[PDB]
């Protein structure tokens, strides 16, 4: 929101000083401020149920002028338990005189998506027939590869044994979505003597990135699986002839590949 | 009664898989703690030199 | 048969404990990595 601040560089000592005096036009909120020492941090005066705090606190940072506008200030004031957000590039500022101004940005920058998305599929295993069926049902919250592209997801299913890729399947493409629905069924001939040695690897890829780095994320179930993945595999084996559906969180391709090697 | 020894076999195998997951937790714990001990080696050095540096 | 069910139940208990331990040691890893890279 609205906010008065000061900015000073002391050339004799080689140090930058920013004042965080007053904030105005807030949405009540019990606030506190924090200094962004561009690539330390400062704990400012924490008000309590104050829709317009004051701090008059100065913040000193001993950076040489050879840093020359490379760094950049950022301040994100939080309603204590990030409502206020404003940033200033270190190279937009003339230190011929100290500066004091009102900035009023009341919107922060949305954090990059860390989770890769989730995939739901069913597993069925018929021991007598030695037949394993995977139904890719749906995926959701897929992480976008690049901003400003459009994502065209599809799924690969690999049946592995002893680290060898035995059989490979793929879904159709669903253009322009992060929440594809498939309901596509794939069958594998796996004799019950072998059913316990195999892994089923499930990868979600972006077709628009085919031929470069295109994997969004993956999981595997079966031999050496862990977590919710083993739990789904064991449910399948516990329930012969019956399809069992479960959600899975997608994991980082390089992490899972290290597990599969 | 072949169904019975099939289901028993899949319980044995569930048990082996559960154990393999437990074994991986123990191996990962050991790997992490070892890496952190290299961290602590460094930290203890730095603190010896920052305490003699006063 | 009882042996199998008992042993599975034991393994399940230790897995539950170690899952908590692995969480705690990842916290430990975070704090120590912080103290170190200085």
């Amino acid at each position: 929101g609205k906010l008065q601040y000061s900015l000073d560089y002391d050339f004799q000592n080689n140090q930058l000083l920013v004042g965080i005096i007053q904030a105005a036009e807030l949405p009540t909120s019990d606030p506190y401020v924090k200094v962004f020492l561009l690539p330390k941090k400062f704990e400012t005066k924490v008000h309590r149920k104050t829709l317009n705090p004051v701090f008059n606190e100065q913040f000193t940072f001993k950076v040489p002028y050879s840093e020359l506008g490379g760094k950049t200030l950022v301040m994100a004031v939080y309603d204590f338990d990030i409502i206020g957000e404003f940033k200033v590039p270190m190279n937009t500022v003339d230190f011929g005189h100290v500066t004091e101004e009102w900035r009023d940005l009341q919107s922060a920058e949305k954090e990059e998506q860390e989770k890769l998305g989730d995939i739901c599929f069913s597993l069925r295993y018929v021991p007598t027939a030695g037949k394993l069926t995977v139904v890719i049902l749906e995926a959701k919250n897929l992480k976008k590869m690049d901003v400003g592209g459009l994502s065209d997801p599809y799924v690969k299913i690999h049946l592995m044994q002893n680290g060898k890729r035995l059989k490979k399947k793929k879904t159709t493409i669903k253009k322009n979505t992060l929440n594809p629905y498939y309901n596509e069924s794939f069958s594998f001939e796996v004799p019950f003597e072998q059913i316990q040695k195999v892994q089923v690897v499930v990868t979600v890829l972006d077709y628009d990135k085919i031929g470069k780095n295109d994997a969004i994320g993956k999981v595997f179930v079966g031999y050496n699986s862990t977590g919710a993945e083993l739990r789904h595999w064991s449910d399948m084996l516990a329930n012969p002839r019956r399809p069992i559906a479960q959600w899975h969180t997608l994991q980082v391709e390089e992490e899972v590949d290290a597990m599969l090697a | 009664a072949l169904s019975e020894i099939e289901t028993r076999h899949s319980e044995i195998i569930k048990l082996e898989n559960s154990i393999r997951e437990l074994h991986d937790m123990f191996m990962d714990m050991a790997m992490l703690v070892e890496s952190q001990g290299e961290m602590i080696d460094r930290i203890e050095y730095n603190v010896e030199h920052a305490v003699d540096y006063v | 048969n009882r042996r199998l069910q008992q042993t599975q139940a034991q393994v399940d208990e230790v897995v539950d404990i170690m899952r908590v331990n692995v969480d705690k040691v990842l916290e430990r890893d975070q704090k120590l990595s912080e103290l170190d890279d200085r």
Binding site: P39, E114, T226, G227, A228, R231, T249, Q251, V252, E255, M259 | E21, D24, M25, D28, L32 | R19, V22, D23, L26, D29, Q30, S33, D37
Partner: peptide
Amino acid sequence: KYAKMEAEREVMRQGIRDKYGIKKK
């Protein structure tokens, strides 16, 4: 540098949590 290996390391960490189904606090 410290940022490349520290971000790489945090990826290793989330790897473990994901693998075992660990939720953060």
